[PDB]
């Protein structure tokens, strides 16, 4: 359960409005970019204000470039006091099976590898904002790899 | 020829258990226990003024 699971526990603060707290109950299958593998973290280290540099929050093509400096993890259950995510690299669960959620506009298949991409699509950049805390959660998009290479390819060619 | 070594004895220390009540500072508290807190999300306190 250290090797099988790994319960990295994102703590939830005290002051969150019940419309904002119940907005996190629809954050089940997500991707959270943990900077380290600490067993106790805060939302500020998860939210986009951790991602921002000095004065500069980068664009979507740069938003890839510190995902791979971090540790993607998937939310397992949203308790009222905490949010638990197992890191992908260490160990998945007891049985080793976690559930995601298609925030894609794209249907998946069995057996295909799934790459996660920043919210690049139109009508899609939906960041669950904490109004009670002034925090945004830029949830990436799980995509099929025959798309997720082309979508990077269109962005690199655009620059 | 005869020689030896020795221990001239061991010394331990005693932790001092400190009850918060023993402190004079408990005057500022009023110490009451939730048998259950962790469940609580947002509690309020309400009293007439």
């Amino acid at each position: 359960m250290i090797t099988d699971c790994f319960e990295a526990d994102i703590a939830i603060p005290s002051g969150i409005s019940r419309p904002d707290a119940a907005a996190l109950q629809r954050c089940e299958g997500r991707v959270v970019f943990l900077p380290t593998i600490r067993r106790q973290l805060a939302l500020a280290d998860v939210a986009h204000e951790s991602f921002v540099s000095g004065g500069v929050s980068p664009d979507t093509l740069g938003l890839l470039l510190a995902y791979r400096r971090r540790f993607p993890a998937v939310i397992t259950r949203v308790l009222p006091t905490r949010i638990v995510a197992c890191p992908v690299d260490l160990g998945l669960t007891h049985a080793g099976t976690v559930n995601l959620r298609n925030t894609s506009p794209v249907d998946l298949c069995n057996g295909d590898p799934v790459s996660l991409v920043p919210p690049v699509f139109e009508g899609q950049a939906t960041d669950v904002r904490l109004e009670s805390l002034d925090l945004t959660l830029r949830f990436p998009v799980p995509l099929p790899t025959p798309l997720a290479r082309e979508i990077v390819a269109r962005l690199v060619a655009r620059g | 020829d005869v020689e030896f070594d020795a221990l001239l004895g061991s010394y331990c220390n005693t932790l001092s258990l400190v009850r918060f009540l023993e402190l004079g500072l408990s005057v500022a508290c009023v110490c009451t226990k939730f048998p259950e807190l962790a469940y609580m999300n947002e509690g309020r306190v309400q009293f007439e003024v």
Binding site: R18, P19, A22, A23, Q25, R26, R77, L79, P80 | E36, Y39, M40, N41, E42, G43, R44, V45, Q46, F47, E48
Partner: peptide, 30 residues
Amino acid sequence: GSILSTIEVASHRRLFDFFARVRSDENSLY
């Protein structure tokens, strides 16, 4: 002749949520 009123603590808890997953409506008070 002083009047004493008991302090009132208002808090709400959802203990069963820990036992099981729940998706309560935001407006309603569990």
